[PDB]
Amino acid sequence: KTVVVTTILESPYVMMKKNHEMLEGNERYEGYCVDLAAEIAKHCGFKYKLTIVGDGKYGCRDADTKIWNGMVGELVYGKADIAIAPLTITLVREEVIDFSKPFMSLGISIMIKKGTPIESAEDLSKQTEIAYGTLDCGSTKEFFRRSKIAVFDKMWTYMRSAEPSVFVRTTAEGVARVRKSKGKYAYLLESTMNEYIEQRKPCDTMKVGGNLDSKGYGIATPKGSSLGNAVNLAVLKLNEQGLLDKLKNKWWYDKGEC
Amino acid sequence: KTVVVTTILESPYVMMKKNHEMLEGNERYEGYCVDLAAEIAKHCGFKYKLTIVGDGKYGCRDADTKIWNGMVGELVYGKADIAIAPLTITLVREEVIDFSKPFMSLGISIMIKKGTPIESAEDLSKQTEIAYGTLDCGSTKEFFRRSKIAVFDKMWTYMRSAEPSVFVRTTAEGVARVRKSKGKYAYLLESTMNEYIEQRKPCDTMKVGGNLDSKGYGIATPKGSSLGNAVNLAVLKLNEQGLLDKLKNKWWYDKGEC
Ligand SMILES: N#Cc1cc2c(cc1[N+](=O)[O-])=NC(=O)C(=O)N=2
Ligand SMILES: N#Cc1cc2c(cc1[N+](=O)[O-])=NC(=O)C(=O)N=2
Ligand SMILES: [Zn+2]
Numbered sequence A, B: 001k002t003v004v005v006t007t008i009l010e011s012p013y014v015m016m017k018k019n020h021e022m023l024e025g026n027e028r029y030e031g032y033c034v035d036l037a038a039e040i041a042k043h044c045g046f047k048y049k050l051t052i053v054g055d056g057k058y059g060c061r062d063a064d065t066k067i068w069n070g071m072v073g074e075l076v077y078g079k080a081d082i083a084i085a086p087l088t089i090t091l092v093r094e095e096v097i098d099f100s101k102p103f104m105s106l107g108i109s110i111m112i113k114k115g116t117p118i119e120s121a122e123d124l125s126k127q128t129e130i131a132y133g134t135l136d137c138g139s140t141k142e143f144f145r146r147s148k149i150a151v152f153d154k155m156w157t158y159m160r161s162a163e164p165s166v167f168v169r170t171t172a173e174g175v176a177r178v179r180k181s182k183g184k185y186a187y188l189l190e191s192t193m194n195e196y197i198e199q200r201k202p203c204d205t206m207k208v209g210g211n212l213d214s215k216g217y218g219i220a221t222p223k224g225s226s227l228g229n230a231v232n233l234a235v236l237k238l239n240e241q242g243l244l245d246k247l248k249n250k251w252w253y254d255k256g257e258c
């Protein structure tokens, strides 16, 4: 029986091979999570088919209709058996699906255009000439809004009333805003994506400072799945075999461009 | 029913209060995990009794007898209901007990006496003047023995044959060796202990370099325990509330001496 794996097109986790039009099935795709899927399936002993999430989303529950979208929806509504993607482990998600132990750690972090005189959140917080913001909705925004920490309160107090708005609609919009702003905008985002972009042409951005919080990506299965136990032990084995680190190094650095 | 928590006297997770002999029950103890225990109990709705693990061990399985010792033992054989301690989440442990998602991240790291001209594992690998080692058995030693990575393979080749022995019997012996060796011994250990010791008098050690691997500590319950789900969700909630970070800062930095 063929396990249906849902994943999402986010580089470098899953990307179309250059010659994808010539290929078929699992072979059309490459990247960190493709490699991970193959390892998980090999060590759990199953055959699988990769499919890209229909709506291109991770997974959130509409307040209005209480319906789950993205990969979480595909699990909860039975369109796929397992999600192998950079899906963040969160309380609201783990209420409806099961997560493996994290396969990759991450945190909120600062992206600057190279040259910008900022090396930390504290630096940002003490000034206003360099503008800075986050996605207009989602966990990073909420992290600042709720923080009782002085530096983060200060940054919230600033971002919430800044004009023009410092919030962006998509991550890509945030990255492009850093790149076209002539050193006048810094963007706050997942450190994994920040370090990824640091190694992409034209090599004009940089990750600075320590992570502001700590989070994990996990592989997700539905409650009571026959796969959940073995998938979890698999993630642990891969980590101890140094394979997760190998995959990270490969996709971020060996294929780096800077 | 009063939940029996097993834990271990490892600073700053669990320590005797200075006036412990005037006190009784849970109140004798303080530390990160004591605070954490209170929070977990409150969010899962149980009363508990902190007990120090009989043998002072974390838990491994004896190769000959196959018997688990330490806190893992107490969980496996039915002596305690939950382990709230810096118990590392590992493949062989997760095969026999359940863990929450990690409450704290760590990795193998390098402890040096201040002034030692070493900034990374690479730096250590390329020289011989400064000796370096790990605990004489256990996971840090095994990480080097099994590594396919060039830098770590080189360090292993050196450590395994170094004379006199670079391995030590206890964490304490490792730290004392760095302190009395005038810069000629560096010790490889968990990053959390490393960073803790850096804030303790006489303030003569430092953690240097990035972590060499990545692991997490998790709260453990016996397989099929009915506490397991609630405890996991409670760990996620505390992270998202900033409470675990607040506790870390508190016990490592607010109470630091350097
Ligand atoms: N950028 C960005 C991202 C945004 C994300 C994400 C991963 C990434 N990522 O590392 O590309 N996982 C999620 O579960 C999520 O709700 N939102
Ligand atoms: N040193 C030391 C340590 C050694 C440890 C540990 C925690 C710590 N710690 O940071 O105190 N947890 C474990 O599960 C373990 O097998 N060995
Ligand atoms: Zn095409």
Ligand SMILES: [Zn+2]
Pocket: A039, A243
């Ligand atoms: Zn493998």
Ligand SMILES: [Zn+2]
Pocket: B016, B020
């Ligand atoms: Zn005493």
Ligand SMILES: [Zn+2]
Pocket: B039, B042
């Ligand atoms: Zn609380």
